Write a protein that binds this ligand. Structure first.
Ligand code: MG
Ligand code: MG
Ligand code: MG
Ligand code: MG
Ligand code: MG
Ligand code: MG
Ligand code: MG
Ligand code: MG
Ligand code: MG
Ligand code: MG
Ligand code: MG
Ligand code: MG
Ligand code: MG
Ligand code: MG
Ligand code: MG
Ligand code: MG
Ligand code: MG
Ligand code: MG
Ligand code: MG
Ligand code: MG
Ligand code: MG
Ligand code: MG
Ligand code: MG
Ligand code: MG
Ligand code: MG
Lengths: 25, 180, 218, 83, 141, 33
RNA sequence: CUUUAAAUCCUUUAACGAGGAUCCAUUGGAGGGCAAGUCUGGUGCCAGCAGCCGCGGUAAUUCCAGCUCCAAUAGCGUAUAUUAAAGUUGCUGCAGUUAAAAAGCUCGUAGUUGGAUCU
RNA sequence: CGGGAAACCAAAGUCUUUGGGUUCCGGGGGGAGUAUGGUUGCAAAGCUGAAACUUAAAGGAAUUGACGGAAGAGCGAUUUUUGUACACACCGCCCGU
């Protein structure tokens, strides 16, 4: 996998976690 | 607390390379020529020579007029001349570096018993020494590695109690005479 | 029977040059192997250091050749190294022996401390390079022996060195580079200007110039 | 060179470059040993005597053997002082 | 380049102290996570109870079934896969037996074809596997 | 009788399973050790 | 007998005590690293060996054995901590274009370093 | 000139003949610039930054071949143009669901 798209996938997964792993929770 | 002493040290160093053909051949030649039991007896003399060389090399870095050099090199040379490895004309500190392990091997009691004609083999010499047939000037010595000093060279003989040195016959002769 | 093809060979065969040091003085290249046989003769002993198979990729498949490394020396001040690649092992070994005795250099031997008796070690610290391999030779006291790897030790013994300390850096698993670096280090012993070589050089007749009349006849 | 007893202990004594004083090694094949003839001051013919110079290969590769030979010949009186 | 001042001892010592942490072995030995994760806890050997017998497939290009045992240590209760090295020695081990286990030789790293196995069996039921293999001692029973 | 030739064995098996052996033989043929 | 508080051990000494002198030396190996057999019989990618590279799928120099051969030797294997090997932590003494690597750029406090000259 | 594995570099020289001053910074390949803590921002994200575990290689320069929907000298292998991560050689190798 191209490193650029791997980095983008990691960032999207982290954003999804951040939405799920809410600071309020 | 106890009244004991714990001072002790090893008398040999094992080689770094376990299987080196040239070293094996040289050590086996030494063992065969001097009738030694194993490799450790070669390593012991090698360690002794290494220590003497290290001391001599440490004394050769000082100034010639240094009192400690004059005091200690004189003692080292005197001891080497006493045991017979060195000669009186070669009592400089540089000649110590020219000594070889065979020089120390030639001064054992086992080789001197053979060289003096008391034994007809080096192995026979070891057997004779270990069986209490040899005395050094008054004392029965049964240690093959006994290093003979120069002044003691003339005084190696059969013991007075030995069947060879004028003593009573041994067990086998007495039993065979009792047979007939 | 030997029939020389060069002036130096004709001079050597006709007993006009006394020693190989006369040739070494004028840095004359040696192109005939029979000169070294004439001078060093029986004292030369050689040893094969490595047989290395190399392969060239072709359309039909790999083509294999064998390379022999041979070190030679007389144990009394001269040493040489040769490398030869051939289709057969025996041919490569013969070529390597010839090439090794062709490139034979003298070795300078010095003292570590007091200068008593015959020289026993290298005059000073000398370094040789080959590829990534660096080899350093340091003088050692009398009776020390050679403290080195098995590969440099053979060349140092053939050169006639009794005592020496050795350091090495780089990929020494490359046996050819390891041997060539220590051969270069040994060769650099006579090219080092020490204070006892500061005297002005007195020139002498070259063998080409001295025996020109004899060369004209033959 | 020699031991404490004074006996010389060497295979041979290598010759040094006349230009740079460097030692000319046994495998230096770019070195030259050149002779320059001497002439009689009255007639100008070949005397039979010559002067010898030795140049190492390092100087020759630098292209500095011409100037070195010229200076050596000037120092020995072969080349005119008002060159 | 490095600083060569006469009063730079603090700089040099501090830099070396900080750059030693980028050595894998130094950090492994001085960090404490490896010691915490080590089932033996720093010991050369351990004793366990044989939970069961398993067969581990050898990694390619080799093909074989290496006989191992799942055991549980007595001092900490951790579960471990140990290798029983010899031809037919797995018949010397029974379930619920007590075994002495040592390392495999590479300091926590797997050895050879066996994947993820770093321990080997030494003694079973207080008798060495070598003596059982050579027929010098019998199982106590 | 000439039974084994180290040169032929090396030149044949230098890339086979028995290379490390035949090399060891060839050296014994060459250096005498 | 001596030893010792009394003993033991060592030393000293009577008598007995070795031909298979059965009064029997073991521990690891035999492809390379690394000293030493592509000898014979089994097994047939199985069982197993192998620190690493590797061996074993019907002629296995590597497994299980017999013979023979190596190494140290009253000692020799194994697991683990540690030192040298490591100039792979580099003060001596390592690197940073492409193998891991110089901050996007500049200013700047502390720190480090600092041109000649006096009999 | 001298360096370097070489490609190449008058600097990438004046290095085992190793010390002009000083700052940052690397320690086999992955896990991973990921988790967690701290901090900055409205957000997107920025800075600092692991371990458990897994693996015997990954990688650089150059050489000979094979492919292409392209036109005496070198340490050494070695001695139509060109590119290659192929060498069981494109019927290859290889990425993600
Ligand atoms: Mg290597
Ligand atoms: Mg297999
Ligand atoms: Mg055995
Ligand atoms: Mg066997
Ligand atoms: Mg081996
Ligand atoms: Mg061998
Ligand atoms: Mg493998
Ligand atoms: Mg069979
Ligand atoms: Mg068989
Ligand atoms: Mg260490
Ligand atoms: Mg060191
Ligand atoms: Mg390390
Ligand atoms: Mg140094
Ligand atoms: Mg490094
Ligand atoms: Mg990079
Ligand atoms: Mg920049
Ligand atoms: Mg400031
Ligand atoms: Mg000043
Ligand atoms: Mg440096
Ligand atoms: Mg890393
Ligand atoms: Mg790792
Ligand atoms: Mg050619
Ligand atoms: Mg060439
Ligand atoms: Mg392209
Ligand atoms: Mg190509």
């Amino acid at each position: 996998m191209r490193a650029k798209w791997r980095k983008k996938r990691m960032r999207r997964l982290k954003r999804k976690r951040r939405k799920m792993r809410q600071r309020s929770k | 607390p106890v009244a004991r002493s714990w001072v002790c040290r090893k008398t040999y160093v094992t080689p770094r390379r376990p299987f080196e053909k040239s070293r094996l051949d040289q050590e086996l030649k030494l063992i065969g020529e001097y009738g030694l039991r194993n490799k450790r007896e070669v390593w012991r003399v090698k360690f002794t020579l290494a220590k003497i060389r290290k001391a001599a090399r440490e004394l050769l870095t000082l100034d010639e007029k240094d009192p400690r050099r004059l005091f200690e090199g004189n003692a080292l040379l005197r001891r080497l001349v006493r045991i017979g490895v060195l000669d009186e004309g070669k009592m400089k500190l540089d000649y110590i570096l020219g000594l070889k392990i065979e020089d120390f091997l030639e001064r054992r009691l086992q080789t001197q018993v053979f060289k003096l004609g008391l034994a007809k083999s080096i192995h026979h010499a070891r057997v004779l020494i270990r069986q209490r047939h040899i005395r050094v000037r008054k004392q029965v010595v049964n240690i093959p590695s006994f290093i003979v000093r120069l002044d003691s060279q003339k005084h190696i003989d059969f013991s007075l109690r030995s069947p060879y040195g004028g003593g009573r016959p041994g067990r086998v002769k007495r039993k065979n005479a009792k047979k007939g | 029977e030997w029939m020389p093809v060069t002036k130096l060979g004709r001079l050597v065969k006709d007993m006009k040059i006394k020693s190989l040091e006369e040739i070494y003085l004028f840095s004359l290249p040696i192109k005939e192997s029979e000169i070294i046989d004439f001078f060093l003769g029986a004292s030369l002993k050689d040893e094969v250091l490595k047989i290395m198979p190399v392969q060239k990729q072709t359309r039909a498949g790999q083509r294999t050749r064998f390379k022999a490394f041979v070190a030679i020396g007389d144990y009394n001040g001269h040493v040489g190294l040769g490398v030869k690649c051939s289709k057969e092992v025996a041919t490569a070994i013969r070529g390597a022996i010839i090439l090794a005795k062709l490139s034979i250099v003298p070795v300078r031997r010095g003292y570590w401390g007091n200068k008593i008796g015959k020289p026993h070690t290298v005059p000073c610290k000398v370094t040789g390079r080959c590829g990534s391999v660096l080899v350093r030779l340091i003088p050692a006291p009398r009776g020390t022996g050679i403290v080195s790897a098995p590969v440099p030790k053979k060349l140092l013994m053939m050169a006639g060195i009794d005592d020496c300390y050795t350091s090495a850096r780089g990929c020494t698993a490359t046996l050819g580079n390891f041997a060539k670096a220590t051969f270069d280090a040994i060769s650099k012993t006579y090219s080092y200007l020490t204070p006892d070589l500061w005297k002005e050089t007195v020139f002498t007749k070259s063998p080409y110039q001295e025996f020109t009349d004899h060369l004209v006849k033959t | 060179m020699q031991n404490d007893a004074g006996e010389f202990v060497d295979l041979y004594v290598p010759r040094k470059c006349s230009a740079s004083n460097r030692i000319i090694g046994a495998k230096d094949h770019a070195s030259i040993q050149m002779n320059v003839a001497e002439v009689d001051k009255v007639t100008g013919r070949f005397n039979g005597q010559f002067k010898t110079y030795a140049i190492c290969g390092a100087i020759r590769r630098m292209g500095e053997s011409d100037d070195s030979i010229l200076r050596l010949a000037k120092a020995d009186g072969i080349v005119s002082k008002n060159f | 380049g490095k600083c060569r001042g006469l009063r730079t001892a603090r700089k040099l010592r501090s830099h070396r102290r900080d750059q030693k942490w980028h050595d894998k072995q130094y950090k492994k030995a001085h960090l404490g996570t490896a010691l915490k994760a080590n089932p033996f806890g720093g010991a050369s050997h351990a004793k366990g109870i044989v939970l069961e017998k398993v067969g581990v497939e050898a990694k390619q290009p080799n093909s074989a079934i290496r006989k191992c045992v799942r055991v549980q240590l007595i001092k900490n209760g951790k579960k471990i896969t140990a290798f029983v090295p010899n031809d037919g020695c797995l018949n010397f081990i029974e379930e619920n037996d007590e075994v002495l286990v040592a390392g495999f030789g590479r300091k926590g790293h797997a050895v050879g074809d066996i994947p993820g196995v770093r321990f080997k069996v030494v003694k079973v039921a207080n008798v060495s596997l070598l003596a059982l293999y050579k027929g010098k001692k019998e199982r106590p029973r | 009788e000439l039974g084994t030739d180290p040169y032929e064995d090396f030149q044949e098996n230098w890339n086979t399973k028995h290379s490390s052996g035949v090399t060891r033989e060839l050296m014994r043929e060459l250096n005498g050790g």
